[PDB]
Symmetry: C3
Subunit: 599 residues, 3 copies
Amino acid sequence: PDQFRAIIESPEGAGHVGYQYRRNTGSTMRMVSDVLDERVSLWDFHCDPSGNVIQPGPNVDSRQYLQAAIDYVSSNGGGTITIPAGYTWYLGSYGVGGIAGHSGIIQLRSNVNLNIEGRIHLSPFFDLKPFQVFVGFDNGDPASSGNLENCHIYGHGVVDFGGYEFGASSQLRNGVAFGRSYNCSVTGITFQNGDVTWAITLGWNGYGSNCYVRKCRFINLVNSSVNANHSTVYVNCPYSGVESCYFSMSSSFARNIACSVQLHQHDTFYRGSTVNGYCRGAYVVMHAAEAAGAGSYAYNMQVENNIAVIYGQFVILGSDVTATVSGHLNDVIVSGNIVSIGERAAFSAPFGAFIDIGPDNSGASNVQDIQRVLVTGNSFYAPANITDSAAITLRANLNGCTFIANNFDCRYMVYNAPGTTSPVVQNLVWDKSNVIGGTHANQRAGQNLFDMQFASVVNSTIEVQLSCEDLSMFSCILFPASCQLSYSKITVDSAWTKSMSNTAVFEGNQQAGANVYVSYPATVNLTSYNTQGAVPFFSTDTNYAWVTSAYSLSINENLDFSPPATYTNKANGQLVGVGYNEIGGVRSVSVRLMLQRQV
Amino acid sequence: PDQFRAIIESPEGAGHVGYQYRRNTGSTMRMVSDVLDERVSLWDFHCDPSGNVIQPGPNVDSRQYLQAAIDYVSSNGGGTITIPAGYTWYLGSYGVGGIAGHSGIIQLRSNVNLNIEGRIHLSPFFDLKPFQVFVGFDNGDPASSGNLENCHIYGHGVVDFGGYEFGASSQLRNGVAFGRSYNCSVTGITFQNGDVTWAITLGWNGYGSNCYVRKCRFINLVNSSVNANHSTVYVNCPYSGVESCYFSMSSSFARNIACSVQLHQHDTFYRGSTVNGYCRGAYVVMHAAEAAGAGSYAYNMQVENNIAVIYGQFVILGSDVTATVSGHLNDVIVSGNIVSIGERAAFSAPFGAFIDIGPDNSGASNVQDIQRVLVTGNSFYAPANITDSAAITLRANLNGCTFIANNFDCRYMVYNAPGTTSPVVQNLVWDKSNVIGGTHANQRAGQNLFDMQFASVVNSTIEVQLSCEDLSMFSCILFPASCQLSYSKITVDSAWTKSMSNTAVFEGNQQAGANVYVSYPATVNLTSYNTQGAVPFFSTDTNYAWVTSAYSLSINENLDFSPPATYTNKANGQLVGVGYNEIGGVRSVSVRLMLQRQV
Amino acid sequence: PDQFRAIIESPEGAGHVGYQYRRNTGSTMRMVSDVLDERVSLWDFHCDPSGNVIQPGPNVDSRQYLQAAIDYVSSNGGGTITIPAGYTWYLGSYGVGGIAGHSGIIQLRSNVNLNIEGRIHLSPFFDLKPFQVFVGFDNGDPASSGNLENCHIYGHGVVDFGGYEFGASSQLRNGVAFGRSYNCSVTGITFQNGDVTWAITLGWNGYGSNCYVRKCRFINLVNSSVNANHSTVYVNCPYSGVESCYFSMSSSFARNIACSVQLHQHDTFYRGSTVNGYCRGAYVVMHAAEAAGAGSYAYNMQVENNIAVIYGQFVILGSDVTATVSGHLNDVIVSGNIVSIGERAAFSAPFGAFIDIGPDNSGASNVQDIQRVLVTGNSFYAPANITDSAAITLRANLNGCTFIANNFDCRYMVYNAPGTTSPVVQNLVWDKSNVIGGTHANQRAGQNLFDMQFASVVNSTIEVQLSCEDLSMFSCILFPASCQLSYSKITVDSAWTKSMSNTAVFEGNQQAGANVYVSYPATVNLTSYNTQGAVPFFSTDTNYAWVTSAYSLSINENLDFSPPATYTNKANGQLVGVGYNEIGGVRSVSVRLMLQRQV
Ligand code: NA
Ligand code: NA
Ligand code: NA
């Protein structure tokens, strides 16, 4: 009797009060403690050394308590700890042990999920300092770390970096560094209000699998000039990806340094997301120095169905090499994305592009092995004032990239700056189904729509089709004499081109090559013999040794004669056709022709 | 001893029974009440004034109890109330205060989520009456309402409107009216069995953000002739959207009035959903009178990867103006959708269309500013009997819309009714990669496949390519004399067209314009001079002053002569070519030619 | 006093300890038991006949306990049973009653969800035996079974089939057989480590609705030679689908027998998933013997945005018939998928294909009714050594299929083995926007890129466009004399084709048909008359009665004359053109021409 009150008021008391589910005679006879033991919260470990519960807050470092929770539940084979709603839980110190090396705060462990319903906020302790809030490595050296398996973070809660700036550019900052991560995920969480390098990294140098980020929000995660670089999510293990996320920045600096996602390993995806205020949408890249876990090929890379306002490049391709590994990038699809360059002055941020073939980090452009890339069904728009805007900026070696059924409304279709890199290009394919918009019409004085500033182009197709007039452009497509061209097909549709002085320009007359197939409009002057009847007409210039046929794009205003409808050429480089003189006399005309070579 | 039994049986008793998580010496020493206080249900507030629990049911209005729950949890900084499974909770009265003005039942509040596992059902009180079940405004005037933040509704439960009809057309009915809503969502819920205006509205006139509807079901939400209009989900704040939802109607009235989604603000999306039995798939629209919260441009509008059986129009574009605001719609992508018009009699429901450029609500067609729209990679099908079916019904001013790589199998490709609106059209682009199906072949007597009933067309491309014969159609494309045409490209591929009397028709000979680029097949009669040898042939008609070249689409059955392969023209409007007379004599032939102008 | 201790220690004790939510004076006065009664776990039913809790494990069959849980909660109108984390719950026996007939273990019931957080593992009892772990039928005969409604399985847990092989090929094995299933779903679960037929089947012969599988993982679910066939998920009710799943196999046998998904009913989808190591991506099929629940048409079938490495066919189409039902398949879209055939020897697994039109299960190829299929915006790749690789293997009757804007890099574009089936083909459309890759260049000796081994082709379009040279191929497109051709358009673009001996081959001269529209390059020898001036040239061969026009694809090396630019024909089958002799004399030349017929 007397001792019973004692048990009950004691910590063992719920262990002495019996329960049976809904008075069901078949249900287990248990104690209240057992049913309470089926869930677990931060409250169960957020206490002083006497077991008295401590209230979280500005002046309480909840780090050790959350760590004890994770360590204990890890002890029992796993489960899910709730971080309670209606409370803000401040972290005010570094973790210890193997996460020491990673500037860790909290160590994640296998099979221990966190359901974050409340808010987690970083304390001023962390101002001007590196940090990585959650860390799945168990060792300061990642090569010697064990794995993190079956760890899920989710809920409706928030993680907040307290608005503190970086202290030096050299510092790193992360939200969730899963480590060598297998079956791990972040779902539903808001990450906000910081200056960090990443919010989440999945995998480490290819080690890991089936990691995902889904329905999270990323807001204002760069805020100072000191921050050297940002990629919100870093997918660095295969069979992993990001979907249905929302990414937003408002800092000027973000527009210069910040990317939403990097995909660095095979079978990874970025889908169904919305981006605003970033410099870059996605890096898709095989880095040789991150190839230890999952081979040296990144393949099956998908970027689909995203919405974006960016200030530089939507999708950046790349590959590179190290002393002993060579990186390859192949089998990539980019489709269904709708993307625009936001309002900004020309040249005020990295050069705007839907696709960029970037050089490596040291800036080498002759190490890349990028091929079998499919860009299809996307739309891109840049405002008319943005000189530095392009469907593709092709700044490094390219072994293939195929464009079909896109809509591009910007300054250049193909661009590379002259006298910079001289890319070697193979298997660039620009199908005629790509629609070229008109927003930059009349803006293109001194400029070439496809400006082919390359070392050489082979096995490529450029099928230019305009949709409106732009008589300001210097040419539709220009190849400088420095660029070799062979086994390629280059064509300009005559629509909207009749008043153009130059349609296709080959500055080293490269269209003469044995295996070059071209067609484009030009104005030609002809003069006939004086014979009544069937009568030949010849070009006055001799620039046409390469032409296999030509046909009229002009009406004939004359009654007493007609020039030929079609032409071929002669050894001396003249065009020749058979027209008709109703009445005799030497004729002289200027006609618009479609010139054709092997097509 | 004596008093102890008293405490324990009392409401404070669980506050006196100690608990420690799994007898762990490091875990907090708590009371049972504390752990029970970590969750909260309707059961905790569904009681009489004495604290005795009340059973929900047909004759119990659970409204006040749920409201007390929400108000209390709101009190503590938020959390999640469970609406328990295995029970139906009837609502039988209006809410009070600021939701009064919105016909509100339950008021939502910030950070208070509802996990709906059971069923919520409307009582007969609400028959023939307006209602809005859940309401995030705090004020009857929305302009003076505060915000709703971080409010999520989810679970496997059901909301049921009890099958009651509208009382008058003027009435409104909604399920979740989030109000000025920021980070709010509805996930997993079934909405069923009613006659309402919307099931869910996100945002209010552009105020709000990051609102979503995901994996919900909408079933039989229109059922009477009195219901004036329905849109199941109304996205009226940016960075918001609908995905992976299911929408179904079985009412005849739904096929005339009901739309699945309206997107009314920037950066919004509708994806991965299935629709059946509706009139309309989606409205995508900038309404000037809903532009107070997020500017006057709707841009970054995405409709992707949906499945639909509808009776009218899949995607409706629009923009309009008010005295002081002008609405603009730009940067829209519609792709990957597979859509069909369900079995119905011709003209039995609003005119079937994949895309409709609709006039404003007053029916004005000269106020719209719609451009940079990309329609790609969709398929559309209407059954052969449905005269009123079209890839695009272009009923109002259009400043651009680009079609690429679609498959359209219906009655018209481009349509507008004659002598209705006279749209001004710019930058309409119909790429040759659009495939035209054959289901309506032989159904097109007296009809034009592309029936261009416009005030004028500029900077547009129509590249017609058939895939099968339809000799019933009057023409492939017809421009009435009333329609101006300039700086456009119009072409008809000869495949399947050889037996066509008319391919392209220009009723005011608009193909003669300086900047009009065309090509299409026609039959022409020619007669030659009698000269042996090289000999000219001339058209007997003089309708060809506009032709720059023509070429044969016919074989030559003759041995003693051949007509020219290619033709040009003369000032008098004749065609002329140089053929060959092996033996002399005047020749006369009818040939099928490809006529070409500046192409 | 004395009796009170008794109550409290007893199973009714929590029913005597009072609780009030957060000491709120307005909250219900309840007992602890009531709040505990709001959740329910396996622990509440995993006891001996005395109510003592039993620990799960290798030597404990948890089947009867889980079944009692489900039966009881079913009793109360539904709810969610947690299968606890940190524990493995072994199943060691068959269920009884109506699931007896289906080799059932656990019977599912309506409104009873399972939240699987721990692991469920099959005991050795099941080695070499059939089994179906979860079963929604209530009757051994499915035609007499009731329905399963509102049943959801989800969590972060695992289902594991213990690695046991099939005992005989005739046996069936499943994970979740939902039965006649309406609003049922599987979310988040890993299925692993077995030898089964399916992991999940939704619906039964068209009965059921709104069933989905989302974010699940399927790993190593085939492991022996005895397993006759595998499809991981079997969607057999409408308005149902699979998304964002991960499928992986490592068994050799899987590459020969295993498919990731079959869609067998209308309005079903397969999206956003990743596949590795399987033979097949998806079957999309109307089976007449599975048409009792939802009609005989499968329509609105979507396969979108998936990533795959497979060894046979990505998407298999089919339809078939029974004595009294005829199956139809129409309105299908396949887009945005990126797919490759994994490294393997040629012919080492079923013939690699992006699309396969397969014959029925008995192998009949004349029963199918497949039409309105849209394949767009996909990429496909097979390694260069894989002879047996194709964009489409067209092995049975086809009533339509449309390809647009794809990238195909494999051995064949269109293929069927000769002297096997002789498919009747209608409305096959291969748009010019399809890009043909170069990986198999130089591998195609004795082979035809489009090898049209059909009974007949009508209303079809093949627009061949190469992107690089392959002079190893016998032809770009070949029609054997056995194949009829009519009302079709067949064309070969001259780019990369100038050195080809054969471009298009018609072995029964089928290009002569009245309604056949073609164009392709050929080399032709001509000789002229000796006349000075305008002078005709004629082909030495008489194979050209069908040509309507031709034009030069060669330059003219000569000065004293030029051959005609364009040609027509004569009754005797010669080509004839008018060229020019500056100086007289008989000329003789070999030119590359574009031959054209009615285009
Ligand atoms: Na060079
Ligand atoms: Na007009
Ligand atoms: Na035949």
